[PDB]
Coordinates of C-alpha atoms and ligand atoms in Angstrom, one line a residue:
Chain A
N3 CA 29.5 -21.6 -23.2
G4 CA 30.5 -22.0 -19.5
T5 CA 30.7 -25.8 -19.3
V6 CA 34.1 -25.0 -20.7
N7 CA 34.7 -23.2 -17.5
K8 CA 33.9 -26.4 -15.6
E9 CA 36.4 -28.3 -17.7
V10 CA 39.1 -25.7 -17.1
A11 CA 38.5 -25.7 -13.4
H12 CA 38.5 -29.5 -13.0
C13 CA 41.9 -29.5 -14.7
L14 CA 43.3 -26.8 -12.5
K15 CA 42.2 -28.9 -9.5
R16 CA 44.0 -32.1 -10.6
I17 CA 47.0 -30.0 -11.4
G18 CA 47.1 -28.5 -7.9
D19 CA 46.8 -31.9 -6.3
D20 CA 49.8 -33.3 -8.2
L21 CA 51.9 -30.5 -6.8
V22 CA 50.9 -31.2 -3.2
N23 CA 51.6 -34.9 -3.7
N24 CA 55.1 -34.2 -4.9
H25 CA 55.9 -32.3 -1.7
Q26 CA 54.2 -34.4 1.1
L27 CA 57.7 -35.1 2.6
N28 CA 60.9 -33.1 3.3
Chain B
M1 CA 61.8 8.5 10.9
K2 CA 61.5 5.8 8.2
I3 CA 62.8 2.3 8.3
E4 CA 66.4 2.3 7.1
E5 CA 69.2 -0.2 7.0
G6 CA 71.8 0.6 9.6
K7 CA 69.5 2.6 11.9
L8 CA 66.8 1.7 14.5
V9 CA 63.4 3.4 14.9
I10 CA 61.5 2.6 18.1
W11 CA 57.8 3.1 18.9
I12 CA 56.8 3.3 22.5
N13 CA 53.7 4.7 24.3
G14 CA 53.9 8.2 25.6
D15 CA 53.5 7.2 29.3
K16 CA 56.8 5.3 29.5
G17 CA 60.4 6.4 30.0
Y18 CA 61.2 7.3 26.4
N19 CA 63.8 9.9 27.3
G20 CA 65.7 7.4 29.4
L21 CA 65.6 4.9 26.6
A22 CA 66.8 7.6 24.3
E23 CA 69.9 8.0 26.5
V24 CA 70.6 4.3 26.1
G25 CA 70.2 5.0 22.4
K26 CA 72.8 7.8 22.5
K27 CA 75.3 5.5 24.4
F28 CA 74.8 2.8 21.8
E29 CA 75.5 5.3 19.0
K30 CA 78.7 6.5 20.8
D31 CA 80.0 3.0 21.3
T32 CA 78.9 1.6 17.9
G33 CA 78.1 4.4 15.5
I34 CA 74.5 3.2 15.0
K35 CA 71.8 5.8 15.4
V36 CA 68.7 5.2 17.5
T37 CA 65.5 7.3 17.2
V38 CA 62.7 6.9 19.8
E39 CA 59.2 8.0 18.9
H40 CA 55.9 8.0 20.8
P41 CA 53.1 8.2 18.3
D42 CA 49.4 8.6 19.1
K43 CA 47.3 5.3 18.8
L44 CA 50.5 3.4 17.8
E45 CA 48.8 0.1 18.6
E46 CA 46.1 0.7 16.0
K47 CA 48.5 2.1 13.3
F48 CA 51.1 -0.6 13.4
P49 CA 48.9 -3.4 11.9
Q50 CA 47.7 -1.0 9.2
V51 CA 51.2 0.1 8.2
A52 CA 53.1 -3.1 8.9
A53 CA 50.7 -4.8 6.6
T54 CA 52.2 -2.6 3.8
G55 CA 55.8 -2.9 4.8
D56 CA 56.1 0.2 6.9
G57 CA 56.2 1.0 10.6
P58 CA 59.0 0.9 13.2
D59 CA 61.8 -1.6 13.6
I60 CA 60.8 -2.2 17.2
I61 CA 57.4 -1.8 18.7
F62 CA 56.8 -1.5 22.5
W63 CA 53.3 -2.4 24.0
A64 CA 51.8 -4.8 26.5
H65 CA 51.5 -8.3 25.3
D66 CA 47.8 -8.5 24.8
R67 CA 48.0 -6.9 21.4
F68 CA 50.7 -9.1 19.9
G69 CA 48.8 -12.3 19.2
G70 CA 46.7 -10.4 16.7
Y71 CA 49.8 -9.0 15.1
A72 CA 51.7 -12.3 14.9
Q73 CA 48.7 -14.2 13.5
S74 CA 48.6 -11.6 10.7
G75 CA 52.3 -12.2 10.1
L76 CA 53.6 -8.8 11.4
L77 CA 56.1 -9.9 14.1
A78 CA 59.4 -11.7 13.6
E79 CA 60.1 -14.8 15.7
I80 CA 62.6 -14.3 18.6
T81 CA 65.3 -16.9 19.5
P82 CA 67.8 -16.1 22.2
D83 CA 70.7 -18.1 23.6
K84 CA 70.0 -20.1 26.8
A85 CA 72.5 -17.9 28.7
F86 CA 70.3 -14.9 27.9
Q87 CA 66.8 -16.5 28.2
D88 CA 68.0 -17.5 31.7
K89 CA 68.7 -13.9 32.8
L90 CA 64.9 -13.1 32.7
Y91 CA 62.0 -14.7 34.5
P92 CA 60.2 -17.6 32.7
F93 CA 56.6 -16.4 33.2
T94 CA 57.6 -13.2 31.3
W95 CA 58.6 -15.3 28.3
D96 CA 55.3 -17.2 28.5
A97 CA 53.4 -14.0 28.0
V98 CA 55.0 -13.5 24.6
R99 CA 54.7 -17.1 23.4
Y100 CA 52.1 -17.5 20.6
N101 CA 51.6 -21.0 19.2
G102 CA 55.0 -22.2 20.4
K103 CA 56.9 -19.1 19.0
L104 CA 58.3 -16.3 21.1
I105 CA 57.3 -13.1 19.3
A106 CA 58.8 -10.4 21.5
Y107 CA 61.3 -9.6 24.4
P108 CA 59.7 -9.1 27.8
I109 CA 60.8 -6.0 29.6
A110 CA 58.7 -5.3 32.7
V111 CA 55.7 -6.7 34.6
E112 CA 52.9 -4.1 35.1
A113 CA 50.0 -4.1 37.5
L114 CA 47.6 -1.5 38.8
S115 CA 47.9 -0.8 42.6
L116 CA 46.0 1.5 45.0
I117 CA 48.0 4.7 45.5
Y118 CA 47.1 6.9 48.5
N119 CA 47.8 10.2 50.3
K120 CA 49.2 9.1 53.7
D121 CA 48.3 12.5 55.1
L122 CA 44.7 12.5 54.0
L123 CA 44.1 8.8 54.3
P124 CA 46.8 7.6 56.6
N125 CA 45.5 4.0 56.5
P126 CA 43.9 3.0 53.2
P127 CA 40.6 1.1 52.9
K128 CA 40.8 -2.7 52.4
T129 CA 37.4 -3.0 50.7
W130 CA 35.6 -1.3 47.8
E131 CA 32.3 -1.2 49.6
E132 CA 33.6 1.1 52.4
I133 CA 34.6 3.8 49.8
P134 CA 31.2 5.6 49.6
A135 CA 31.2 6.3 53.3
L136 CA 34.8 7.5 53.1
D137 CA 33.9 10.0 50.3
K138 CA 31.1 11.9 52.1
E139 CA 33.5 12.0 55.0
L140 CA 36.2 13.7 52.9
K141 CA 33.9 15.9 50.8
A142 CA 32.9 17.3 54.2
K143 CA 36.5 18.7 54.0
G144 CA 36.4 19.7 50.3
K145 CA 38.3 16.5 49.4
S146 CA 37.4 13.4 47.5
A147 CA 38.1 9.7 48.4
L148 CA 39.0 8.3 45.0
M149 CA 39.5 9.4 41.4
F150 CA 40.8 7.2 38.6
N151 CA 40.4 6.9 34.8
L152 CA 37.0 5.6 33.9
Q153 CA 37.6 6.1 30.2
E154 CA 39.9 3.0 29.6
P155 CA 38.4 -0.4 30.6
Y156 CA 41.9 -1.5 31.9
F157 CA 41.1 0.6 35.0
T158 CA 37.6 -0.8 35.7
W159 CA 38.2 -4.4 34.8
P160 CA 39.7 -5.4 38.2
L161 CA 36.4 -4.7 39.7
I162 CA 34.3 -6.3 36.9
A163 CA 36.4 -9.5 37.2
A164 CA 36.4 -9.6 41.0
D165 CA 33.1 -11.6 41.5
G166 CA 33.3 -13.7 38.4
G167 CA 33.8 -11.5 35.3
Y168 CA 36.0 -13.1 32.6
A169 CA 36.8 -12.5 29.0
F170 CA 37.3 -15.9 27.4
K171 CA 36.9 -19.3 29.0
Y172 CA 40.1 -21.3 29.0
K176 CA 42.1 -24.0 24.4
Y177 CA 40.2 -20.6 24.6
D178 CA 36.6 -20.8 23.5
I179 CA 35.8 -17.8 21.2
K180 CA 32.1 -18.5 21.8
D181 CA 32.0 -18.4 25.7
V182 CA 32.9 -14.9 26.7
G183 CA 31.5 -14.2 30.2
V184 CA 31.1 -10.4 30.2
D185 CA 27.4 -10.7 30.8
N186 CA 27.5 -13.1 33.7
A187 CA 26.2 -12.3 37.2
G188 CA 29.6 -11.4 38.7
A189 CA 30.3 -9.0 35.8
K190 CA 26.8 -7.4 36.2
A191 CA 27.5 -7.1 40.0
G192 CA 30.9 -5.3 39.5
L193 CA 29.8 -2.8 36.9
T194 CA 26.7 -2.1 39.0
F195 CA 28.8 -1.1 41.9
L196 CA 30.9 1.1 39.6
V197 CA 27.8 2.8 38.1
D198 CA 26.2 3.2 41.5
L199 CA 29.3 5.1 42.8
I200 CA 28.8 7.5 39.9
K201 CA 25.0 7.9 40.2
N202 CA 25.5 8.5 43.9
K203 CA 27.9 11.3 43.2
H204 CA 31.1 9.7 44.5
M205 CA 32.8 9.8 41.1
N206 CA 32.2 11.6 37.8
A207 CA 31.6 9.5 34.7
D208 CA 33.8 12.0 32.7
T209 CA 36.9 11.5 34.8
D210 CA 40.0 10.4 32.8
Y211 CA 43.7 9.9 33.2
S212 CA 44.9 13.6 33.5
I213 CA 42.0 14.7 35.7
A214 CA 42.7 12.0 38.3
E215 CA 46.5 12.6 38.3
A216 CA 46.2 16.3 38.8
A217 CA 43.6 15.7 41.6
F218 CA 45.8 13.3 43.5
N219 CA 49.2 15.1 42.9
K220 CA 47.6 18.4 44.0
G221 CA 46.2 16.9 47.1
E222 CA 42.5 17.1 46.2
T223 CA 41.7 13.3 46.3
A224 CA 42.9 10.8 48.8
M225 CA 43.4 7.8 46.4
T226 CA 43.9 6.8 42.8
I227 CA 44.5 3.6 40.9
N228 CA 47.5 3.5 38.6
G229 CA 50.7 1.7 37.5
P230 CA 54.4 2.3 38.2
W231 CA 54.8 4.7 35.3
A232 CA 52.9 7.3 37.4
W233 CA 55.2 7.2 40.5
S234 CA 57.6 9.7 38.9
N235 CA 55.1 12.6 38.7
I236 CA 54.0 11.9 42.3
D237 CA 57.5 12.2 43.6
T238 CA 57.9 15.6 42.0
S239 CA 54.6 16.8 43.6
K240 CA 56.2 16.1 47.0
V241 CA 52.9 14.4 48.1
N242 CA 53.4 12.0 50.9
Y243 CA 52.1 8.8 49.3
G244 CA 52.3 5.0 49.6
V245 CA 51.6 2.1 47.2
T246 CA 49.5 -0.9 48.3
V247 CA 47.1 -3.7 47.4
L248 CA 43.8 -2.9 45.7
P249 CA 40.5 -3.2 47.7
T250 CA 38.3 -6.3 47.7
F251 CA 34.8 -6.6 46.3
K252 CA 32.3 -9.1 47.9
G253 CA 35.2 -10.5 49.9
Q254 CA 37.3 -11.4 46.8
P255 CA 40.4 -9.7 45.4
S256 CA 40.3 -7.1 42.7
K257 CA 41.6 -9.1 39.7
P258 CA 43.6 -6.7 37.4
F259 CA 44.5 -7.9 33.9
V260 CA 48.3 -8.0 34.1
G261 CA 50.5 -6.7 31.3
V262 CA 54.2 -7.4 30.4
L263 CA 55.7 -4.5 28.6
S264 CA 57.3 -6.2 25.6
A265 CA 59.4 -5.2 22.6
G266 CA 58.4 -6.9 19.3
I267 CA 60.4 -6.8 16.0
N268 CA 58.5 -5.8 12.9
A269 CA 58.5 -8.7 10.3
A270 CA 59.3 -6.0 7.7
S271 CA 62.4 -4.7 9.5
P272 CA 65.8 -5.2 7.7
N273 CA 67.6 -4.7 11.1
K274 CA 66.4 -7.8 12.9
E275 CA 69.7 -8.9 14.2
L276 CA 70.9 -5.4 15.2
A277 CA 67.6 -4.9 17.0
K278 CA 68.2 -8.0 19.0
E279 CA 71.7 -7.3 20.2
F280 CA 70.8 -3.7 21.2
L281 CA 67.9 -5.0 23.3
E282 CA 70.0 -7.8 24.8
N283 CA 73.3 -5.9 25.5
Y284 CA 72.1 -2.3 26.0
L285 CA 68.5 -2.2 27.2
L286 CA 68.4 -5.5 29.2
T287 CA 71.3 -4.8 31.6
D288 CA 71.4 -3.2 35.0
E289 CA 72.7 0.1 33.6
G290 CA 70.2 0.1 30.7
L291 CA 67.0 -0.6 32.6
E292 CA 68.1 1.9 35.3
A293 CA 68.4 4.7 32.7
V294 CA 64.8 4.1 31.6
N295 CA 63.6 3.5 35.2
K296 CA 64.9 6.9 36.2
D297 CA 62.7 8.6 33.6
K298 CA 59.5 6.7 34.5
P299 CA 59.4 3.6 36.7
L300 CA 59.1 0.3 34.8
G301 CA 57.7 -1.8 37.7
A302 CA 58.9 -5.3 38.2
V303 CA 61.6 -5.8 35.6
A304 CA 62.2 -9.1 33.8
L305 CA 65.9 -8.9 34.4
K306 CA 66.7 -11.0 37.5
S307 CA 69.9 -9.2 38.4
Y308 CA 68.3 -5.8 38.6
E309 CA 64.9 -6.8 40.0
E310 CA 66.7 -8.3 43.0
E311 CA 67.6 -4.8 44.0
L312 CA 64.3 -3.2 43.0
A313 CA 62.3 -5.9 44.9
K314 CA 63.4 -4.2 48.2
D315 CA 61.3 -1.1 47.4
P316 CA 57.9 -1.5 49.1
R317 CA 56.3 -0.1 45.9
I318 CA 57.5 -3.0 43.9
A319 CA 56.4 -5.5 46.6
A320 CA 52.9 -4.0 46.3
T321 CA 53.1 -4.2 42.5
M322 CA 53.8 -7.9 42.6
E323 CA 51.1 -8.6 45.2
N324 CA 48.4 -7.1 43.0
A325 CA 49.8 -9.0 40.0
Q326 CA 49.5 -12.4 41.7
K327 CA 45.8 -11.7 42.4
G328 CA 44.9 -10.9 38.8
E329 CA 45.4 -12.8 35.5
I330 CA 48.1 -12.4 32.9
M331 CA 46.2 -11.1 29.9
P332 CA 45.6 -13.5 27.0
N333 CA 47.5 -12.6 23.8
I334 CA 44.9 -13.9 21.4
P335 CA 43.6 -12.0 18.3
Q336 CA 40.1 -11.5 19.8
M337 CA 41.4 -9.5 22.8
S338 CA 41.0 -6.4 20.7
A339 CA 37.2 -6.9 20.1
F340 CA 36.7 -7.8 23.8
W341 CA 38.3 -4.5 24.9
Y342 CA 36.4 -2.5 22.3
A343 CA 33.2 -4.1 23.4
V344 CA 33.8 -3.6 27.1
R345 CA 34.9 0.0 26.4
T346 CA 31.5 0.9 24.9
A347 CA 29.6 -1.0 27.6
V348 CA 31.3 0.7 30.6
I349 CA 31.1 4.2 28.9
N350 CA 27.4 3.7 28.2
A351 CA 26.3 2.3 31.5
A352 CA 28.3 5.0 33.3
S353 CA 27.0 7.9 31.3
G354 CA 23.4 6.5 31.7
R355 CA 22.5 5.7 28.1
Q356 CA 21.8 2.0 28.8
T357 CA 21.2 -0.3 31.7
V358 CA 24.0 -2.7 32.8
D359 CA 21.9 -5.6 31.5
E360 CA 21.5 -4.0 28.0
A361 CA 25.1 -2.9 27.7
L362 CA 26.9 -6.1 29.0
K363 CA 24.6 -8.0 26.6
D364 CA 25.8 -5.9 23.8
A365 CA 29.3 -6.6 25.1
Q366 CA 28.5 -10.3 25.0
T367 CA 27.5 -10.5 21.3
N368 CA 30.0 -7.9 20.1
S369 CA 32.8 -9.7 21.9
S370 CA 32.2 -12.6 19.4
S371 CA 33.1 -12.1 15.8
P376 CA 38.7 -8.3 5.7
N377 CA 40.4 -5.4 4.0
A378 CA 43.6 -5.5 6.1
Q379 CA 44.3 -9.1 5.1
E380 CA 43.7 -8.2 1.5
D381 CA 46.5 -5.7 1.6
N382 CA 48.7 -8.4 3.1
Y383 CA 47.9 -10.8 0.3
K384 CA 48.2 -8.2 -2.4
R385 CA 52.0 -7.8 -1.7
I386 CA 52.5 -11.5 -2.5
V387 CA 50.0 -11.5 -5.4
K388 CA 51.8 -8.4 -6.8
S389 CA 55.3 -9.8 -6.7
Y390 CA 54.1 -12.9 -8.7
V391 CA 51.9 -11.1 -11.3
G392 CA 54.7 -8.6 -11.8
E393 CA 57.2 -11.4 -12.6
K394 CA 54.8 -13.1 -15.0
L395 CA 54.4 -9.7 -16.7
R396 CA 58.1 -9.2 -17.2
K397 CA 58.2 -12.8 -18.5
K398 CA 55.8 -12.0 -21.3
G399 CA 57.4 -8.7 -22.2
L400 CA 54.7 -6.5 -20.8
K401 CA 55.5 -3.0 -19.4
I402 CA 52.7 -2.1 -17.0
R403 CA 52.8 1.0 -14.7
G404 CA 53.4 0.2 -11.1
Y405 CA 54.4 -3.4 -12.0
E406 CA 58.0 -2.2 -12.8
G407 CA 60.9 -3.5 -10.7
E408 CA 60.8 -5.6 -7.5
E409 CA 61.9 -3.8 -4.3
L410 CA 60.4 -6.4 -2.0
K411 CA 60.6 -6.1 1.8
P412 CA 61.7 -8.7 4.3
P413 CA 58.8 -11.1 4.7
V414 CA 57.8 -11.2 1.0
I415 CA 61.4 -11.8 -0.2
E416 CA 61.4 -15.4 1.0
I417 CA 57.8 -16.0 0.3
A418 CA 58.1 -14.7 -3.2
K419 CA 61.1 -16.9 -3.8
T420 CA 59.4 -20.1 -2.7
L421 CA 56.2 -19.2 -4.6
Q422 CA 58.0 -18.7 -7.9
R423 CA 59.8 -22.0 -7.5
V424 CA 56.8 -24.2 -6.9
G425 CA 54.6 -22.2 -9.3
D426 CA 57.0 -22.9 -12.2
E427 CA 56.9 -26.5 -11.2
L428 CA 53.1 -26.6 -11.7
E429 CA 52.9 -25.1 -15.2
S430 CA 56.1 -26.6 -16.5
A431 CA 54.3 -29.9 -16.2
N432 CA 51.2 -28.5 -18.1
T433 CA 52.6 -26.1 -20.7
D434 CA 49.9 -26.8 -23.3
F435 CA 46.8 -26.5 -21.1
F436 CA 47.9 -23.1 -19.9
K437 CA 49.1 -21.6 -23.1
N438 CA 45.6 -22.3 -24.6
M439 CA 43.6 -21.5 -21.5
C440 CA 42.3 -18.2 -22.6
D441 CA 41.3 -19.2 -26.1
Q442 CA 38.9 -21.7 -24.5
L443 CA 37.2 -19.2 -22.1
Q444 CA 36.6 -16.3 -24.5
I445 CA 36.7 -13.7 -21.9
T446 CA 35.2 -10.2 -22.6
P447 CA 34.7 -7.1 -20.4
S448 CA 31.1 -8.3 -19.8
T449 CA 31.9 -11.9 -19.1
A450 CA 35.2 -11.5 -17.3
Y451 CA 34.2 -11.2 -13.6
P452 CA 31.7 -14.1 -13.7
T453 CA 34.1 -16.4 -15.6
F454 CA 36.9 -15.6 -13.0
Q455 CA 34.5 -16.4 -10.0
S456 CA 32.9 -19.4 -11.7
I457 CA 36.2 -21.1 -12.3
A458 CA 37.8 -20.2 -9.0
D459 CA 34.8 -21.6 -7.1
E460 CA 34.9 -24.9 -9.0
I461 CA 38.6 -25.4 -8.1
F462 CA 37.8 -25.4 -4.4
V463 CA 34.3 -26.9 -4.3
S464 CA 35.7 -30.3 -3.1
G465 CA 38.3 -28.8 -0.7
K466 CA 41.5 -26.9 -0.2
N467 CA 45.3 -27.6 0.0
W468 CA 48.5 -25.6 -0.6
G469 CA 48.6 -27.0 -4.2
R470 CA 45.1 -25.9 -5.0
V471 CA 46.1 -22.5 -3.9
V472 CA 49.2 -22.3 -6.1
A473 CA 47.1 -23.6 -9.0
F474 CA 44.6 -20.8 -8.2
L475 CA 47.4 -18.1 -8.1
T476 CA 48.8 -19.3 -11.4
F477 CA 45.3 -19.2 -13.0
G478 CA 44.7 -15.6 -11.8
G479 CA 48.1 -14.5 -12.9
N480 CA 47.6 -15.9 -16.4
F481 CA 44.1 -14.4 -16.4
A482 CA 45.7 -11.0 -15.6
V483 CA 48.4 -11.2 -18.3
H484 CA 45.7 -12.1 -20.8
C485 CA 43.7 -9.0 -19.8
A486 CA 46.7 -6.7 -20.3
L487 CA 47.0 -8.2 -23.8
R488 CA 43.6 -7.1 -25.1
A489 CA 43.3 -3.5 -26.3
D490 CA 39.7 -3.4 -25.0
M491 CA 40.9 -4.3 -21.4
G492 CA 43.9 -2.2 -20.4
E493 CA 46.4 -1.7 -17.7
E494 CA 43.2 -1.0 -15.8
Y495 CA 42.3 -4.7 -15.8
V496 CA 45.7 -5.6 -14.3
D497 CA 45.4 -4.0 -10.9
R498 CA 41.7 -5.0 -11.1
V499 CA 42.4 -8.7 -11.5
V500 CA 45.2 -8.5 -8.9
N501 CA 42.5 -7.2 -6.6
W502 CA 40.0 -9.9 -7.5
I503 CA 42.7 -12.4 -6.6
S504 CA 43.7 -10.7 -3.4
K505 CA 40.1 -10.3 -2.2
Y506 CA 39.3 -13.9 -3.1
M507 CA 42.0 -15.0 -0.8
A508 CA 41.1 -12.7 2.1
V509 CA 37.4 -13.7 1.7
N510 CA 37.5 -17.3 0.9
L511 CA 40.9 -18.8 1.9
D512 CA 42.3 -16.8 4.9
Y513 CA 40.7 -19.2 7.4
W514 CA 42.4 -22.3 6.0
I515 CA 45.7 -20.4 5.5
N516 CA 45.9 -19.4 9.1
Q517 CA 44.7 -22.9 10.3
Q518 CA 47.7 -24.4 8.4
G519 CA 50.3 -22.0 9.8
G520 CA 50.3 -18.7 7.7
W521 CA 53.0 -18.1 5.2
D522 CA 55.6 -19.6 7.6
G523 CA 53.8 -22.9 7.0
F524 CA 53.9 -22.3 3.3
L525 CA 57.7 -21.8 3.7
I526 CA 58.0 -25.1 5.5
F527 CA 55.7 -27.3 3.4
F528 CA 57.6 -26.4 0.2
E529 CA 61.1 -26.0 1.8
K530 CA 64.0 -27.4 -0.2
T531 CA 66.5 -30.2 0.0
Ligands
LIG1 O1 39.6 0.7 25.2 C1 40.1 1.0 23.9 C2 41.4 0.4 23.7 O2 41.4 -1.0 24.1 C3 42.7 -1.8 24.0 O3 43.7 -1.2 24.8 C4 44.1 -2.1 25.9 C5 45.5 -2.4 25.9 O4 45.7 -3.4 24.9 C6 46.0 -3.0 27.2 O5 47.4 -3.2 27.2 C7 45.7 -2.0 28.4 O6 46.5 -0.9 28.1 C8 47.2 -0.4 29.3 C9 48.7 -0.7 29.2 O7 48.8 -2.1 29.4 C10 49.3 0.0 30.3 O8 50.8 -0.1 30.2 C11 49.1 1.5 30.4 O9 49.8 2.2 29.4 O10 47.7 1.9 30.2 C12 46.9 1.1 29.2 C13 45.5 1.5 29.4 O11 45.3 2.8 29.2 O12 44.2 -1.7 28.4 C14 43.7 -1.2 27.1 C15 42.2 -1.1 27.3 O13 41.9 -0.1 28.2 C16 43.2 -1.7 22.5 O14 44.4 -2.4 22.4 C17 43.2 -0.3 22.0 O15 43.5 -0.3 20.6 C18 41.9 0.5 22.2 O16 42.2 1.8 21.9

């Protein structure tokens, strides 16, 4: 029921980290 | 007057020279065609952060500098950046007062310090020491006169005495957790004050107007006040002079020193016009003189004019008292310190507490949500709105943009990097809601449950954008279901905004506020 929620949240995290890594430098 | 492109609205406290400023305004209008309106609203320093946080308020706000750190940390003041030729026309320590984390956030106008003001006919030579004032008062009440009356209702006026023998607000790189309002020197100064009252030398009810009438009618020999007050004394014809405050336990009275400053609202659309008015109309010899004629400013920041003013003995005394005090901190906690010391003085003076109980309230209260939420909601609203238009949804109050200055740039950057994130994950997101199976009865716990699991291992600007894209998609999905209406849209927008104010505001400020956001994700 909610362990889906855990799956969704783990994905959103990895997604966010990818964005940060693509902008570490300017 | 409302904020309006092509006009200036100015807020300034009612004890300053607002009619003289208004005349500078008129001259500006004559020479340039631009209209200037000067207002002096009640409690303007508490209103500004409420209304600026929603995009309202004046173009230019005048106040002493202690209030501005709190405003800037909330994002409400625009950074100031003058030419070297202009920065050099004003004294450097006045610029230091308005520097908050390396950024200048206002224009310094005048240095303000309390001095002892006295009636040369009834006290031809003023006391040098606080302790000798009780004897002076019985000596004057013999004659139906008083020795001293000043405002006991604002802590500004009593703080020089509380600080004299060791009182301090924050230990200096300032430690929020070491305040110093309940140390021995503080207890000693407030005890002197409260003893003067209990021994019938002052009245705990006395306030600004009562003391001014007293002194300017001739009924009390001394008062404590700033240069703004000289003007009414001159009209009274009283024979006065202006000198250094008395000492307590051999040490100087240490007034908290203020720099009257003009800050520029971060929501103003007239930032550049505001700057060139201040620099070319207010901050000249003719400009400061027009204001000074109305109410004296004190020791002005403008070198060329102060060099004349300095030859006035009253300005000399102003600067002597300023060097014995401390320039106020500008940090955000200053507000809670002043509120805490307000209550403690008022209570000890009236008699409702002992000094030891009150200054120990002041100690805890000096140390450590809704206003930040309203800040964040502007950003959250611009982004949820755009995602709504993108899906073809027409939701009341989410129609049209109409964004005001700070959020324009933020909104732009946020849409750019947000599209980055989900363009790279188009499937996961399009199916996100069919996984969760939200319902009116499971919606709030699912939103929290997922949000919490994003951040359990830590935070970064990308985990925040991921979070904002989740909540935006959550919102659009709620609008889509006939059992969860337009009502769920503003409801989820609130969930998102509160979640940020509650759980993320600390990290966001630690990493620079939205100006840091702008730099982290800046282009090319
Ligand atoms: O006590 C309640 C009050 O505390 C805080 O006000 C402080 C001001 O921030 C501070 O500048 C100083 O105010 C003086 C101005 O500098 C001076 O030019 C002149 O106008 O008188 C002022 C004092 O009356 O001291 C006060 C504290 O007394 C806080 O910011 C307020 O919101 C709050 O109402």
